[PDB]
């Protein structure tokens, strides 16, 4: 790969520069190169990996949503035949999005998840695995959709099981996993009651644990708790 000749430490340094410059594609490429050096990622490095790909796919998802909305309007009664272009361009963005998801999932499967034994790292990577399968599920229409949904649920569930055993309720990774799995239930899996139940129990159990939360993690965990409350307000 194009990053094979660069030192691991230089790749991490440049991922940090790319983040500051909001160059998320470059950030992701640097972090993929770092992962491919074959050493486990530290806690800070895991965050660089996740932020890079979250931002790349986030932009692709936003664009896909705009184009899918145009396409759906184009297929309603009274809409004028505008030819294949909207579908073609939506398919182009979709295929690029799928490619990025596949790249992330490949990194996770080789070999980040296999070698992650500490709960932080294992839950973190399984959450990512659930997230990228969820993004594939958002665009899946074919025979593939149910299997993709099942793959997302299986990753999120393994992460949930570990997080409940090994992390406190206010751990930010545990909270963010529960936030995203609740969104999976609501938006992907047609299980709004499960989504609401998960968000409420997560929020309530985190409140009761706030008295043990570190000042260093207060900001991250309270932000995620606010996002859980925002979703519950949207949903009820």
């Amino acid at each position: 790969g194009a990053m094979g000749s660069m030192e691991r430490a230089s790749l991490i340094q440049k991922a940090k520069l790319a983040e500051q410059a909001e160059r998320y594609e470059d950030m992701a490429a640097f972090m993929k190169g770092a992962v491919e050096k074959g050493e486990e990622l530290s806690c800070e490095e895991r965050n660089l990996l996740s932020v890079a790909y979250k931002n790349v796919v986030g932009g692709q998802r936003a664009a896909w949503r705009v184009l899918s909305s145009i396409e759906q309007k184009s297929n309603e009664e009274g809409s004028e035949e505008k030819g294949p272009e909207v579908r073609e361009y939506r398919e182009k963005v979709e295929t690029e999005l799928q490619g990025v998801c596949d790249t992330v999932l490949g990194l996770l499967d080789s070999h980040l998840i296999k070698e992650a034994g500490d709960a932080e790292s294992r839950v973190f990577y399984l959450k990512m695995k659930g997230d990228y399968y969820r993004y594939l599920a958002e665009v899946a229409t074919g025979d593939d959709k149910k299997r993709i949904i099942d793959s997302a649920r299986s990753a999120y569930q393994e992460a949930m099981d570990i997080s409940k055993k090994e992390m406190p309720p206010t751990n930010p990774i545990r909270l963010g996993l529960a936030l995203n799995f609740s969104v999976f239930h609501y938006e992907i899996a047609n299980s709004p009651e499960e989504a609401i139940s998960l968000a409420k129990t997560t929020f309530d159990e985190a409140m009761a644990d706030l008295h043990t939360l570190s000042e260093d993690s207060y900001k991250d965990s309270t932000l995620i708790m606010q996002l859980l409350r925002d979703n519950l307000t949207l949903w009820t």
Binding site: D131, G176, L179, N180, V183, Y186, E187, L223, I224, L227, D230, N231, L234, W235
Partner: peptide, 5 residues
């Protein structure tokens, strides 16, 4: 859309 992190 709902919030994720």
């Amino acid at each position: 859309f709902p919030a994720t992190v």
